[PDB]
Amino acid sequence: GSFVVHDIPSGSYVVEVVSPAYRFDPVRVDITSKGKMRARYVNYIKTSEVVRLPYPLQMKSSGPPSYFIKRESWGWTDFLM
Amino acid sequence: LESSSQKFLQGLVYLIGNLMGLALAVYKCQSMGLLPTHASDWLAFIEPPERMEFSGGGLLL
Amino acid sequence: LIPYSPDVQIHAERFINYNQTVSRMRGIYTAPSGLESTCLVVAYGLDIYQ
Amino acid sequence: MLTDMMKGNVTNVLPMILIGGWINMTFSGFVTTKVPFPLTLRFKPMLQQGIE
Amino acid sequence: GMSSLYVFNPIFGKWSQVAPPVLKRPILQSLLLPVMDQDYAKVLLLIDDEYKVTAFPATRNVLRQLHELAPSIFFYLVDAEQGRLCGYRLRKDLTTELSWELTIPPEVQRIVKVKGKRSSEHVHSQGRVMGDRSVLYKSLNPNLLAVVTESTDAHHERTFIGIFLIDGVTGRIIHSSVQKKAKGPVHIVHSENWVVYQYWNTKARRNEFTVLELYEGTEQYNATAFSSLDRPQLPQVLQQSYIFPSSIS
Amino acid sequence: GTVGLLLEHSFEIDDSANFRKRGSLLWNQQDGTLSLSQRQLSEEERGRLRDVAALNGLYRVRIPRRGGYVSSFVPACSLVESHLSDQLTLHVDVAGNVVGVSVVTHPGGCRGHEVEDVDLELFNTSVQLQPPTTAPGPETAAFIERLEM
Ligand SMILES: *[C@@H]1O[C@H](CO)[C@@H](O[C@@H]2O[C@H](CO)[C@@H](O[C@@H]3O[C@H](CO)[C@@H](O)[C@H](O)[C@@H]3O)[C@H](O)[C@H]2NC(C)=O)[C@H](O)[C@H]1NC(C)=O
Ligand SMILES: *[C@@H]1O[C@H](CO)[C@@H](O[C@@H]2O[C@H](CO)[C@@H](O[C@@H]3O[C@H](CO)[C@@H](O)[C@H](O)[C@@H]3O)[C@H](O)[C@H]2NC(C)=O)[C@H](O)[C@H]1NC(C)=O
Ligand SMILES: *[C@@H]1O[C@H](CO)[C@@H](O[C@@H]2O[C@H](CO)[C@@H](O[C@@H]3O[C@H](CO)[C@@H](O)[C@H](O)[C@@H]3O)[C@H](O)[C@H]2NC(C)=O)[C@H](O)[C@H]1NC(C)=O
C-alpha cells in the first residue's frame, strides 16, 4: 500500500482513500511554493491549525462502515411488561 | 314542577343553568381547536387552479 | 423547527448504494411508480444500477 | 348534591383505550380506511398517530 | 446540420409506417403540446431556422384546434455564443412574431445551463401553516425559466456567478441573485417552487449550498385562473447557506 | 455622466411592425436617478389606442441599448379598462450593461367596463432601477460563538 501522486500545482488539498470496503478519514494537506508540506485535520467550520502531525501520511482504517440499519425484536422477558 | 306561578319562573332559571353550561362547553370546544373556523382548515380543502397559456423552450439553438 | 446550523454531515446509514457503486455518475433518472410512495431510481454512467 | 355529578360515569373509557393502544402498537405504519366525513387538521395527531 | 425524425415502437421495436419529411435548415427546437387529437395521440410541432412551425400529425381537427388556440403558445430560445434570449409566439395559423427580447454581454457573463419546470408535476398543498394558525400562500409558476450565467474571467478573487429568474411568457425578471467569490462546476435543480444550486468558494476551500424559495403573502389572488399576463406582484425570495463536504457530480 | 435612452411604442391592428419616438429618458449611472419625459398623444392616437384595445392586441415597447435591441409586450386591454398606469423597470449588470426592461401594470384586470377621453390625456409612468443583489454566505461565526456560549 502506498499512494504516489505527481503533476500537482500549489494549493491545499484533501487526501481521501475511497473504498467500498474499510473506509478512511480524509486528511488536509497544505502545499507551499517553497516546498513545505503541512498536514492537518479536516476542519470546515474552523480555518485554523488544530493539530500538526508528521508528513508521511499513515492512515489507519477503523473498519467496515455501517451500510445497513439494525432492527431488533421483542424479548420474552421484555414482552411481559 | 307546576305548583304555583312563582316556581314556574324558577324553572326558567333552571334552564338558564343548562344554557350557561352549554356556553362554557362551546367556549372550551373552540379554545382546544374542535371547531375549525380558520383559514388553514379551508386551505386543506382548496383545489389547484387550472393553468392556461403554456410556454416552452430550451437551449438547443 | 430545528435550530439553524451550517454543518451537514454525510451519514452512512442514509446510503442507498450499500455495496454496488458507480465509478462515474453521469446522471440519475427518477421515475414515479404507481402506488403512492415508490420512486424507481436508475443511475447511468460507466455502469447501470437500478 | 355535588357527588351526584362527581361520581357519574366519567372514568369508564380507559379500558377501551388500552385495547386501542395495543391494536395500534401491533400495526405501526398502516392505513386502514378513509372516512367520507370531512375532518379538521387538528384531529390528525389523534387520528393517524404513527404516519409521518 | 442535418435533422431527422424517427417513429418507432418502445414495446416491440418495429417502426411504424408514418414519418414526415424535413427540408430547409436543421430543426432548432421542439415542443410537446398537451392537447390530444386524432385517435388518442398528442400533437408535436417543430421550429425551423426559417422561423416556421411544422406539425407532425397532419390532421384537419389537429390544425383546427391549433388555430383555435392561436395566441396561447410561446417559444423562448437561448444562445451561448450569441447571448441573446428571444421570445416568439404563434399568430393565427402559423407564423412567428417577436414579443420579448433579452440580451446579455458575452464578454462579461456566459450562459451555461437552463432548467425549467417538469410537465408531469402536480402539487397537493397550495399553502403552508404559519406560527399561530394563519395560512401562507405559495407562488407556483408553471411558466418560469431559470438561467445560470458565470464569469468568463477566472481569478482567485474576481469571480462572478449568478442566477436569473425570467418568465417565458413576458420578459420580466423576478429575482436576480449574484455571488462574489464562487467558481467552478455549478449544479442547479428546479422544483415545485424551490431552486437548489451549489457552488465552490475560492476564498475558503469549501462548497457552499444555497437554497432559494419563492413565497407569496397571506392573501390569495384569483386562485381559479393562472396567467402571466396578469399577476403584477413580486414574490418574496428567501436564501440560505449550508456546507457540503463533497463534489456533487 | 448622464445618458439618454430611446423609448418607442408599438400600435397596430394585429401585427407589430411600426414604431415611433415617444419620449426621452435620462439615466445617471454614477448617481442612480432615472428621469422620464415623453410627449402627449394626439386625439387620433387616442382613438387608435381605443380601437386596438377593444380588439385585444399587444403593446410592444422598443428600447435600443448601445448593439442590442430590447422589446417587451404588455396587454393594452387592461390599460384601457383601467386608468393609465405603467411601471418601467431597467435591468442592469454589475457594470454598465443593459439586460432589458419590463412594463408592469398595477390593476392587471380584465373586466372591461368603459374608458372616457378625460382619462386618456396624461401619461402616468414610474421608472425603477434593479441592480444585482449580493447573496449571503454561511454565518458560521455566530454558530461558533453560540456553541462556545
Ligand atoms: C458486499 O459484497 C460482498 C461480496 O463481494 C459480501 O460478501 C459476501 O456476502 C454474501 C452475502 O451477501 C455471503 O454469502 C453468504 O454465504 C454463506 C455461506 O458461506 C451463507 O450461509 C449466507 O446465507 C450467505 O449466502 C458471502 O459469504 C460473503 N463473502 C465474503 C467473502 O464475506 C459482503 O458481505 C457485502 N457487504 C455487506 C453485506 O456489507
Ligand atoms: C379569474 O379568472 C377567470 C378566468 O380568466 C375569470 O373568469 C372569466 O371572466 C371573463 C370576463 O368576465 C368571462 O368572459 C365572459 O365571456 C362572456 C361570453 O363568453 C361575456 O359575455 C362576458 O361579458 C365575459 O367577457 C369568462 O367567461 C370567465 N370564465 C369563467 C370560467 O367563469 C374571473 O373573472 C377572474 N376573477 C377575477 C376576480 O379576476
Ligand atoms: C399615477 O401614478 C401614481 C403613482 O404610480 C398613482 O398613485 C398611486 O395611486 C394608487 C391608487 O390610485 C395608490 O394605491 C393605494 O395603495 C394603498 C397601499 O399602498 C392602498 O391602501 C390604497 O387603497 C390604494 O390602493 C398608490 O399608493 C399610489 N402611489 C404609488 C403607486 O406610488 C396615481 O393614482 C396615478 N394616477 C392616475 C390618475 O392613475
Curated annotation (Swiss-Prot), chain B:
Family designation: Belongs to the EMC4 family.
Disulfide cysteine pairs (residue numbers): none
Key word Endoplasmic reticulum present: yes
Function, in words: Part of the endoplasmic reticulum membrane protein complex (EMC) that enables the energy-independent insertion into endoplasmic reticulum membranes of newly synthesized membrane proteins. Preferentially accommodates proteins with transmembrane domains that are weakly hydrophobic or contain destabilizing features such as charged and aromatic residues. Involved in the cotranslational insertion of multi-pass membrane proteins in which stop-transfer membrane-anchor sequences become ER membrane spanning helices.
Residue ranges annotated as Lumenal topological domain: 27-61
GO CC annotations, alphabetized: EMC complex; endoplasmic reticulum membrane; membrane
Name of the featured protein: ER membrane protein complex subunit 4
Example of a GO biological process term: apoptotic process
Cellular localization per UniProt: Endoplasmic reticulum membrane
Tissue specificity statement from the Swiss-Prot or TrEMBL entry: Isoform 1 is expressed in brain and heart. Isoform 2 is expressed in heart.
Organism: Homo sapiens (Human)
Segments traversing the membrane: 6-26
Keywords assigned: Acetylation, Apoptosis, Endoplasmic reticulum, Membrane, Phosphoprotein, Transmembrane, Transmembrane helix
First-to-last residue of the parent protein present: 123 to 183 of 183
Topology Cytoplasmic: residue spans: 1-5
Coiled-coil boundaries: none
Quaternary structure and interacting proteins, as annotated: Component of the ER membrane protein complex (EMC).
Swiss-Prot record, chain D:
Lumenal compartment segments: 26-52
Organism for this UniProt entry: Homo sapiens
Coverage span on the entire protein: 106 to 157 of 261
Transmembrane region(s): 10-25
Subcellular location: Endoplasmic reticulum membrane
Quaternary context: Component of the ER membrane protein complex (EMC).
Protein role: Part of the endoplasmic reticulum membrane protein complex (EMC) that enables the energy-independent insertion into endoplasmic reticulum membranes of newly synthesized membrane proteins. Preferentially accommodates proteins with transmembrane domains that are weakly hydrophobic or contain destabilizing features such as charged and aromatic residues. Involved in the cotranslational insertion of multi-pass membrane proteins in which stop-transfer membrane-anchor sequences become ER membrane spanning helices.
Signal peptide range: none
Top-level taxon: Eukaryota
Protein name (record): ER membrane protein complex subunit 3
Similarity section: Belongs to the EMC3 family.
Coiled-coil intervals, chain numbering: none
From Swiss-Prot, chain E:
Glycosites: N222
Keyword Endoplasmic reticulum appears in the UniProt entry: yes
UniProt keywords, alphabetically: Disease variant, Disulfide bond, Endoplasmic reticulum, Glycoprotein, Membrane, Neurodegeneration, Signal, Transmembrane, Transmembrane helix
Cellular location(s): Endoplasmic reticulum membrane
GO CC field: EMC complex; endoplasmic reticulum membrane; membrane; protein-containing complex
Swiss-Prot/TrEMBL GO biological process terms: protein insertion into ER membrane by stop-transfer membrane-anchor sequence; tail-anchored membrane protein insertion into ER membrane
Principal location listed in the UniProt entry: endoplasmic reticulum
Record family assignment: Belongs to the EMC1 family.
Disease connection: Cerebellar atrophy, visual impairment, and psychomotor retardation: An autosomal recessive, neurodegenerative disorder characterized by developmental delay, intellectual disability, hypotonia, scoliosis, cerebellar atrophy, and variable dysmorphic features.
Role noted for this protein: Part of the endoplasmic reticulum membrane protein complex (EMC) that enables the energy-independent insertion into endoplasmic reticulum membranes of newly synthesized membrane proteins. Preferentially accommodates proteins with transmembrane domains that are weakly hydrophobic or contain destabilizing features such as charged and aromatic residues. Involved in the cotranslational insertion of multi-pass membrane proteins in which stop-transfer membrane-anchor sequences become ER membrane spanning helices.
Protein name, entry field: ER membrane protein complex subunit 1
Curated annotation (Swiss-Prot), chain F:
Disease per record: Neurodevelopmental disorder with dysmorphic facies and variable seizures: An autosomal recessive disorder characterized by global developmental delay apparent in early childhood, mildly impaired intellectual development, speech delay, behavioral abnormalities, and non-specific dysmorphic facial features. Some patients may have seizures, brain imaging abnormalities, mild skeletal defects, and renal abnormalities.
Record's GO cellular component terms: EMC complex; endoplasmic reticulum membrane; extracellular region; membrane
Tissues of expression: Present in serum (at protein level). Increased expression seen in the left ventrice after myocardial infarction (at protein level). Expressed in the pituitary gland. Expressed in brain.
Residues of the full protein shown: 50 to 207 of 262
Source organism (scientific name): Homo sapiens
Residue positions the entry lists as glycosylated: N124
Family: Belongs to the EMC10 family.
Lumenal topological segments: 1-149
Post-translational events: Glycosylated.
Keyword field contains Glycoprotein: yes
Keywords (A to Z) from UniProt: Angiogenesis, Endoplasmic reticulum, Glycoprotein, Intellectual disability, Membrane, Secreted, Signal, Transmembrane, Transmembrane helix
Cystine pairings recorded for this chain: none
Subunit structure: Component of the ER membrane protein complex (EMC).
One GO BP annotation of this record: positive regulation of endothelial cell proliferation
Name of the molecule in the record: ER membrane protein complex subunit 10
